[PDB]
Design a protein around this ligand. Structure first.
Ligand code: CA
Ligand code: CA
Ligand code: CA
Ligand code: CA
Ligand code: CA
Ligand code: CA
Ligand code: CA
Ligand code: CA
Ligand code: CA
Lengths: 205, 205
Protein backbone atom coordinates (compact mmCIF):
# COMPACT_ATOMS: atom_id res chain seq x y z
CA UNK A 1 0.00 0.00 0.00
CA UNK A 2 0.78 3.71 0.03
CA UNK A 3 -1.29 3.98 3.27
CA UNK A 4 1.06 3.54 6.19
CA UNK A 5 1.86 0.36 8.03
CA UNK A 6 -0.07 0.84 11.40
CA UNK A 7 1.67 0.14 14.77
CA UNK A 8 3.72 -2.89 15.81
CA UNK A 9 4.14 -3.48 19.60
CA UNK A 10 5.86 -6.37 21.35
CA UNK A 11 6.05 -7.02 25.10
CA UNK A 12 8.27 -9.75 26.54
CA UNK A 13 10.17 -12.77 25.21
CA UNK A 14 13.68 -14.24 25.46
CA UNK A 15 14.59 -12.48 22.14
CA UNK A 16 12.46 -10.24 19.87
CA UNK A 17 12.68 -9.68 16.10
CA UNK A 18 10.31 -7.44 14.16
CA UNK A 19 11.00 -7.47 10.43
CA UNK A 20 9.04 -4.99 8.33
CA UNK A 21 9.18 -4.73 4.53
CA UNK A 22 7.73 -2.25 2.03
CA UNK A 23 6.78 -3.38 -1.51
CA UNK A 24 4.98 -0.30 -2.89
CA UNK A 25 5.00 0.81 -6.52
CA UNK A 26 7.71 2.74 -8.31
CA UNK A 27 6.28 6.26 -8.07
CA UNK A 28 4.63 6.11 -4.68
CA UNK A 29 5.74 6.70 -1.13
CA UNK A 30 4.82 4.30 1.66
CA UNK A 31 5.84 5.39 5.10
CA UNK A 32 6.57 2.29 7.33
CA UNK A 33 5.36 1.23 10.84
CA UNK A 34 6.22 2.63 14.25
CA UNK A 35 7.68 -0.10 16.31
CA UNK A 36 7.70 -0.50 20.10
CA UNK A 37 9.45 -3.35 21.90
CA UNK A 38 9.27 -3.55 25.69
CA UNK A 39 11.29 -6.43 27.16
CA UNK A 40 10.29 -8.48 30.16
CA UNK A 41 13.07 -9.65 32.43
CA UNK A 42 14.02 -12.45 29.96
CA UNK A 43 14.74 -10.18 27.00
CA UNK A 44 18.43 -10.37 26.08
CA UNK A 45 18.18 -9.15 22.39
CA UNK A 46 15.93 -7.03 20.14
CA UNK A 47 16.07 -6.70 16.34
CA UNK A 48 14.05 -4.18 14.30
CA UNK A 49 14.56 -4.33 10.50
CA UNK A 50 12.71 -2.19 7.89
CA UNK A 51 13.07 -1.54 4.11
CA UNK A 52 15.65 1.19 3.36
CA UNK A 53 14.31 4.77 2.99
CA UNK A 54 14.38 6.34 -0.52
CA UNK A 55 12.95 9.33 -2.31
CA UNK A 56 9.92 8.66 -4.51
CA UNK A 57 11.23 8.85 -8.06
CA UNK A 58 10.27 7.95 -11.64
CA UNK A 59 11.62 4.44 -11.05
CA UNK A 60 12.46 4.67 -7.35
CA UNK A 61 9.97 3.27 -4.83
CA UNK A 62 9.63 5.83 -1.98
CA UNK A 63 9.94 4.80 1.70
CA UNK A 64 9.96 6.71 5.00
CA UNK A 65 11.03 4.80 8.13
CA UNK A 66 9.09 4.20 11.34
CA UNK A 67 10.22 5.38 14.79
CA UNK A 68 11.52 2.57 16.96
CA UNK A 69 11.32 2.56 20.78
CA UNK A 70 13.10 -0.17 22.69
CA UNK A 71 12.79 -0.32 26.49
CA UNK A 72 14.14 -2.87 29.05
CA UNK A 73 11.99 -3.81 32.19
CA UNK A 74 14.42 -2.18 34.65
CA UNK A 75 14.71 1.03 32.68
CA UNK A 76 13.10 3.20 35.35
CA UNK A 77 14.39 1.22 38.40
CA UNK A 78 17.10 2.52 40.72
CA UNK A 79 18.33 -1.01 41.59
CA UNK A 80 17.02 -3.78 39.32
CA UNK A 81 19.59 -5.27 36.88
CA UNK A 82 18.22 -4.91 33.32
CA UNK A 83 18.50 -7.65 30.67
CA UNK A 84 18.64 -6.15 27.10
CA UNK A 85 22.30 -6.58 26.03
CA UNK A 86 22.25 -6.44 22.18
CA UNK A 87 20.01 -4.39 19.86
CA UNK A 88 20.09 -4.81 16.08
CA UNK A 89 18.68 -2.16 13.71
CA UNK A 90 18.26 -2.39 9.87
CA UNK A 91 17.04 1.11 8.85
CA UNK A 92 15.02 3.40 11.21
CA UNK A 93 13.37 6.78 11.81
CA UNK A 94 13.68 8.37 15.27
CA UNK A 95 15.09 5.37 17.23
CA UNK A 96 15.49 5.09 21.10
CA UNK A 97 17.05 2.42 23.29
CA UNK A 98 16.87 2.40 27.09
CA UNK A 99 18.80 -0.38 28.86
CA UNK A 100 21.38 -0.45 31.64
CA UNK A 101 22.54 -3.84 30.41
CA UNK A 102 23.25 -2.62 26.83
CA UNK A 103 26.70 -3.36 25.35
CA UNK A 104 26.22 -3.86 21.61
CA UNK A 105 24.25 -2.02 18.94
CA UNK A 106 24.27 -3.33 15.35
CA UNK A 107 23.46 -0.75 12.71
CA UNK A 108 22.55 -1.15 9.07
CA UNK A 109 20.74 0.76 6.26
CA UNK A 110 19.05 4.17 6.53
CA UNK A 111 18.67 5.94 9.89
CA UNK A 112 17.39 9.19 11.29
CA UNK A 113 18.59 9.32 14.93
CA UNK A 114 19.54 6.92 17.64
CA UNK A 115 19.32 8.01 21.27
CA UNK A 116 20.95 5.59 23.72
CA UNK A 117 19.89 5.86 27.36
CA UNK A 118 21.02 3.47 30.09
CA UNK A 119 18.72 2.50 32.98
CA UNK A 120 18.23 5.09 35.74
CA UNK A 121 20.35 2.87 38.08
CA UNK A 122 21.83 5.03 40.87
CA UNK A 123 24.91 2.78 41.36
CA UNK A 124 28.02 3.98 39.44
CA UNK A 125 28.46 1.61 36.45
CA UNK A 126 31.75 -0.20 36.04
CA UNK A 127 31.53 -1.73 32.49
CA UNK A 128 31.19 1.23 30.04
CA UNK A 129 32.09 -0.07 26.60
CA UNK A 130 29.68 0.54 23.73
CA UNK A 131 30.41 -1.81 20.83
CA UNK A 132 28.83 -0.29 17.74
CA UNK A 133 28.98 -2.54 14.70
CA UNK A 134 28.13 -0.76 11.50
CA UNK A 135 27.49 -2.11 7.99
CA UNK A 136 25.98 -0.06 5.19
CA UNK A 137 24.68 2.49 7.71
CA UNK A 138 23.79 6.10 6.73
CA UNK A 139 22.39 8.63 9.20
CA UNK A 140 20.40 11.83 8.66
CA UNK A 141 21.25 12.86 12.22
CA UNK A 142 22.77 11.91 15.51
CA UNK A 143 23.75 8.84 17.41
CA UNK A 144 23.64 10.30 20.98
CA UNK A 145 24.65 8.89 24.37
CA UNK A 146 21.71 10.44 26.21
CA UNK A 147 23.01 8.98 29.52
CA UNK A 148 26.44 10.73 29.35
CA UNK A 149 25.10 14.33 29.65
CA UNK A 150 23.67 14.31 33.23
CA UNK A 151 24.53 10.68 34.26
CA UNK A 152 27.13 7.96 33.59
CA UNK A 153 27.63 7.29 29.86
CA UNK A 154 30.08 5.13 27.94
CA UNK A 155 33.77 5.95 28.47
CA UNK A 156 35.02 3.87 25.50
CA UNK A 157 33.14 3.61 22.10
CA UNK A 158 34.21 0.96 19.56
CA UNK A 159 32.95 1.19 16.01
CA UNK A 160 33.43 -1.81 13.73
CA UNK A 161 32.60 -0.99 10.10
CA UNK A 162 31.78 -4.09 8.07
CA UNK A 163 31.34 -5.28 4.43
CA UNK A 164 29.92 -1.81 3.39
CA UNK A 165 30.61 1.93 3.88
CA UNK A 166 28.90 3.69 6.69
CA UNK A 167 28.28 7.39 7.38
CA UNK A 168 27.19 8.80 10.75
CA UNK A 169 26.09 12.42 10.29
CA UNK A 170 26.82 13.19 13.98
CA UNK A 171 28.15 11.18 16.93
CA UNK A 172 27.48 12.80 20.35
CA UNK A 173 29.14 11.01 23.33
CA UNK A 174 29.91 13.48 26.14
CA UNK A 175 31.54 10.88 28.53
CA UNK A 176 33.69 9.26 25.87
CA UNK A 177 37.44 8.80 26.44
CA UNK A 178 38.72 6.34 23.79
CA UNK A 179 37.24 5.85 20.31
CA UNK A 180 38.48 2.90 18.27
CA UNK A 181 37.36 2.50 14.70
CA UNK A 182 37.99 -1.04 13.46
CA UNK A 183 37.14 -3.69 10.87
CA UNK A 184 36.48 -4.08 7.25
CA UNK A 185 34.94 -1.13 5.44
CA UNK A 186 35.02 2.66 5.75
CA UNK A 187 33.44 4.39 8.67
CA UNK A 188 32.80 8.08 8.19
CA UNK A 189 31.79 10.32 11.09
CA UNK A 190 30.80 13.65 9.63
CA UNK A 191 30.76 15.36 13.07
CA UNK A 192 31.56 14.24 16.59
CA UNK A 193 30.78 16.03 19.84
CA UNK A 194 32.97 14.24 22.38
CA UNK A 195 34.77 16.88 24.45
CA UNK A 196 36.36 14.46 26.93
CA UNK A 197 38.14 12.38 24.23
CA UNK A 198 41.80 11.57 25.08
CA UNK A 199 42.48 9.38 21.98
CA UNK A 200 41.12 8.15 18.64
CA UNK A 201 42.51 4.93 17.12
CA UNK A 202 41.80 3.56 13.64
CA UNK A 203 42.67 -0.02 13.05
CA UNK A 204 40.23 -0.37 10.11
CA UNK A 205 41.48 -1.78 6.75
CA UNK B 1 31.26 -17.52 51.59
CA UNK B 2 32.40 -16.26 55.00
CA UNK B 3 31.65 -12.75 56.23
CA UNK B 4 34.69 -11.81 58.35
CA UNK B 5 34.05 -8.19 59.39
CA UNK B 6 35.84 -7.13 62.58
CA UNK B 7 37.83 -10.40 63.05
CA UNK B 8 41.08 -8.58 63.35
CA UNK B 9 43.28 -11.10 65.12
CA UNK B 10 43.19 -13.50 62.14
CA UNK B 11 46.63 -14.19 60.66
CA UNK B 12 45.93 -17.61 59.13
CA UNK B 13 42.99 -18.50 56.89
CA UNK B 14 43.33 -22.04 55.65
CA UNK B 15 40.56 -23.36 53.44
CA UNK B 16 43.03 -25.54 51.56
CA UNK B 17 41.45 -28.93 52.39
CA UNK B 18 37.97 -28.06 50.88
CA UNK B 19 36.96 -30.37 47.87
CA UNK B 20 34.30 -29.93 44.96
CA UNK B 21 34.37 -28.72 41.19
CA UNK B 22 32.80 -25.63 42.86
CA UNK B 23 33.05 -25.66 46.63
CA UNK B 24 33.80 -21.92 46.34
CA UNK B 25 35.36 -20.15 49.32
CA UNK B 26 35.12 -16.37 49.75
CA UNK B 27 37.21 -14.54 52.35
CA UNK B 28 38.33 -10.96 53.10
CA UNK B 29 40.88 -10.32 55.93
CA UNK B 30 39.74 -7.78 58.50
CA UNK B 31 43.35 -7.55 59.88
CA UNK B 32 44.73 -4.04 60.54
CA UNK B 33 48.00 -4.82 62.38
CA UNK B 34 50.58 -2.76 60.46
CA UNK B 35 53.27 -4.97 58.96
CA UNK B 36 51.52 -8.30 59.64
CA UNK B 37 52.19 -11.65 58.00
CA UNK B 38 48.72 -13.02 56.98
CA UNK B 39 48.35 -16.39 55.19
CA UNK B 40 45.24 -16.98 53.01
CA UNK B 41 44.67 -20.47 51.51
CA UNK B 42 41.96 -21.43 48.96
CA UNK B 43 40.51 -24.89 48.20
CA UNK B 44 39.45 -26.85 45.12
CA UNK B 45 36.69 -24.27 44.37
CA UNK B 46 36.66 -21.07 42.34
CA UNK B 47 37.73 -19.02 45.40
CA UNK B 48 37.70 -15.26 46.13
CA UNK B 49 40.47 -14.28 48.52
CA UNK B 50 41.19 -10.66 49.51
CA UNK B 51 44.04 -9.52 51.80
CA UNK B 52 44.48 -6.32 53.84
CA UNK B 53 46.22 -3.08 52.79
CA UNK B 54 47.88 -3.30 56.21
CA UNK B 55 49.43 -6.66 55.55
CA UNK B 56 52.00 -8.73 53.83
CA UNK B 57 49.47 -11.32 52.59
CA UNK B 58 50.54 -14.69 51.21
CA UNK B 59 47.50 -15.74 49.16
CA UNK B 60 47.24 -19.21 47.58
CA UNK B 61 44.20 -20.50 45.58
CA UNK B 62 43.96 -24.27 45.02
CA UNK B 63 42.55 -25.84 41.89
CA UNK B 64 39.92 -23.78 39.94
CA UNK B 65 39.28 -20.18 38.86
CA UNK B 66 40.65 -18.21 41.84
CA UNK B 67 40.47 -14.44 42.29
CA UNK B 68 43.32 -13.07 44.44
CA UNK B 69 42.98 -9.40 45.44
CA UNK B 70 45.79 -6.92 46.07
CA UNK B 71 45.07 -4.09 48.51
CA UNK B 72 48.54 -2.89 49.60
CA UNK B 73 51.86 -4.04 51.12
CA UNK B 74 54.29 -6.82 50.28
CA UNK B 75 52.02 -9.57 48.93
CA UNK B 76 52.84 -13.03 47.55
CA UNK B 77 50.24 -14.57 45.18
CA UNK B 78 50.02 -18.13 43.90
CA UNK B 79 46.88 -19.12 42.02
CA UNK B 80 47.47 -22.86 41.61
CA UNK B 81 46.06 -24.82 38.70
CA UNK B 82 43.31 -23.17 36.57
CA UNK B 83 42.46 -19.80 35.00
CA UNK B 84 43.28 -17.57 37.98
CA UNK B 85 42.58 -13.84 38.02
CA UNK B 86 45.05 -11.53 39.87
CA UNK B 87 42.89 -8.52 40.64
CA UNK B 88 45.14 -5.51 41.36
CA UNK B 89 43.23 -2.87 43.28
CA UNK B 90 46.16 -0.96 44.75
CA UNK B 91 49.13 0.95 43.50
CA UNK B 92 51.67 -0.13 46.20
CA UNK B 93 55.18 1.34 46.50
CA UNK B 94 58.50 0.43 44.86
CA UNK B 95 59.28 -1.89 47.79
CA UNK B 96 55.77 -2.94 48.93
CA UNK B 97 54.33 -4.51 45.78
CA UNK B 98 52.72 -7.79 44.71
CA UNK B 99 54.83 -10.69 43.51
CA UNK B 100 52.86 -13.31 41.52
CA UNK B 101 54.81 -16.57 41.83
CA UNK B 102 53.32 -18.80 39.11
CA UNK B 103 51.77 -16.68 36.34
CA UNK B 104 51.12 -19.06 33.44
CA UNK B 105 49.16 -19.34 30.20
CA UNK B 106 45.43 -18.76 30.96
CA UNK B 107 45.85 -16.63 34.10
CA UNK B 108 44.64 -13.01 33.93
CA UNK B 109 45.94 -9.72 35.40
CA UNK B 110 43.07 -7.34 36.15
CA UNK B 111 44.46 -3.80 36.23
CA UNK B 112 41.08 -1.91 36.28
CA UNK B 113 41.86 -0.58 39.80
CA UNK B 114 45.12 1.18 38.80
CA UNK B 115 43.74 3.04 35.64
CA UNK B 116 44.25 6.27 37.68
CA UNK B 117 43.96 8.49 34.62
CA UNK B 118 41.47 6.92 32.19
CA UNK B 119 41.73 3.28 31.08
CA UNK B 120 44.61 1.02 29.95
CA UNK B 121 45.89 0.25 26.41
CA UNK B 122 43.20 -2.21 25.20
CA UNK B 123 45.57 -3.52 22.48
CA UNK B 124 47.75 -6.66 22.50
CA UNK B 125 50.59 -4.28 23.69
CA UNK B 126 53.52 -6.70 23.77
CA UNK B 127 57.10 -5.66 22.93
CA UNK B 128 59.26 -5.95 26.10
CA UNK B 129 61.22 -2.88 27.20
CA UNK B 130 64.89 -3.78 26.54
CA UNK B 131 67.83 -2.15 28.22
CA UNK B 132 71.59 -2.60 28.51
CA UNK B 133 73.76 -5.45 29.82
CA UNK B 134 73.98 -3.83 33.31
CA UNK B 135 70.78 -1.75 33.59
CA UNK B 136 69.39 -1.62 37.15
CA UNK B 137 65.84 -2.35 38.35
CA UNK B 138 65.63 1.38 39.12
CA UNK B 139 66.68 2.14 35.50
CA UNK B 140 64.18 -0.36 33.96
CA UNK B 141 61.38 1.26 36.06
CA UNK B 142 62.29 4.83 35.02
CA UNK B 143 62.61 3.60 31.39
CA UNK B 144 59.14 1.96 31.55
CA UNK B 145 57.51 5.07 32.99
CA UNK B 146 59.26 7.48 30.58
CA UNK B 147 56.01 8.43 28.76
CA UNK B 148 53.15 10.72 29.77
CA UNK B 149 50.43 9.10 31.92
CA UNK B 150 48.74 12.36 33.03
CA UNK B 151 45.71 12.08 30.72
CA UNK B 152 45.91 8.37 29.95
CA UNK B 153 47.60 5.56 31.95
CA UNK B 154 49.84 3.16 30.00
CA UNK B 155 51.09 -0.37 30.51
CA UNK B 156 54.63 -1.51 29.79
CA UNK B 157 56.68 -4.53 30.87
CA UNK B 158 60.31 -5.80 31.23
CA UNK B 159 62.52 -8.64 32.44
CA UNK B 160 65.14 -7.94 35.12
CA UNK B 161 67.35 -10.34 37.02
CA UNK B 162 65.40 -13.45 36.04
CA UNK B 163 61.92 -12.14 36.90
CA UNK B 164 59.24 -10.40 34.83
CA UNK B 165 57.71 -6.98 35.78
CA UNK B 166 54.61 -5.05 34.62
CA UNK B 167 54.21 -1.26 35.02
CA UNK B 168 51.39 1.32 34.96
CA UNK B 169 52.54 4.84 34.17
CA UNK B 170 50.15 7.45 35.51
CA UNK B 171 52.67 10.34 35.60
CA UNK B 172 54.36 13.23 33.73
CA UNK B 173 58.20 12.85 33.95
CA UNK B 174 60.45 9.89 33.13
CA UNK B 175 60.70 9.11 36.88
CA UNK B 176 58.73 6.12 38.05
CA UNK B 177 57.06 7.84 41.02
CA UNK B 178 56.52 5.39 43.93
CA UNK B 179 53.15 6.94 44.85
CA UNK B 180 51.03 6.87 41.64
CA UNK B 181 53.00 4.68 39.20
CA UNK B 182 52.70 0.95 39.84
CA UNK B 183 54.93 -2.13 39.55
CA UNK B 184 53.88 -5.81 39.64
CA UNK B 185 56.56 -8.60 39.93
CA UNK B 186 56.10 -12.03 38.30
CA UNK B 187 58.55 -14.74 39.37
CA UNK B 188 60.49 -16.17 36.36
CA UNK B 189 60.77 -15.23 32.69
CA UNK B 190 57.26 -15.06 31.34
CA UNK B 191 56.88 -13.65 27.81
CA UNK B 192 53.92 -11.28 27.52
CA UNK B 193 54.70 -10.56 23.80
CA UNK B 194 51.55 -12.21 22.35
CA UNK B 195 49.31 -11.62 25.43
CA UNK B 196 46.36 -9.17 25.09
CA UNK B 197 44.49 -6.50 27.15
CA UNK B 198 40.69 -7.36 27.46
CA UNK B 199 39.12 -4.33 29.10
CA UNK B 200 41.92 -3.47 31.44
CA UNK B 201 42.52 -7.19 31.85
CA UNK B 202 45.66 -8.94 30.56
CA UNK B 203 45.13 -12.60 29.50
CA UNK B 204 48.37 -14.67 29.35
CA UNK B 205 48.85 -16.38 25.92
CA1 CA C 1 18.58 7.37 32.47
CA1 CA D 1 22.97 6.76 37.47
CA1 CA E 1 29.02 12.07 33.16
CA1 CA F 1 40.64 -22.64 44.49
CA1 CA G 1 48.03 -6.74 51.43
CA1 CA H 1 43.92 -21.71 41.06
CA1 CA I 1 47.04 -20.77 37.34
CA1 CA J 1 39.64 -4.23 40.17
CA1 CA K 1 55.77 9.14 33.19
Amino acid sequence: STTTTGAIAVTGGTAVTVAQTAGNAVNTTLTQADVTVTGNSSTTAVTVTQTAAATAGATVAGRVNGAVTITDSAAASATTAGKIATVTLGSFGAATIDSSALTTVNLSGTGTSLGIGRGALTATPTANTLTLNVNGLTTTGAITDSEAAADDGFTTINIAGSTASSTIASLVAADATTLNISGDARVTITSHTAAALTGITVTNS
Amino acid sequence: NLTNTGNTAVTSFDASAVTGTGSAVTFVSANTTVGEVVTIRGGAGADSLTGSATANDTIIGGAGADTLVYTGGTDTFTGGTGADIFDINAIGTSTAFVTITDAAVGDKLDLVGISTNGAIADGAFGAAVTLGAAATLAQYLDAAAAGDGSGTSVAKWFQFGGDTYVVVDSSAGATFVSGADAVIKLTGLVTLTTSAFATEVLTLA
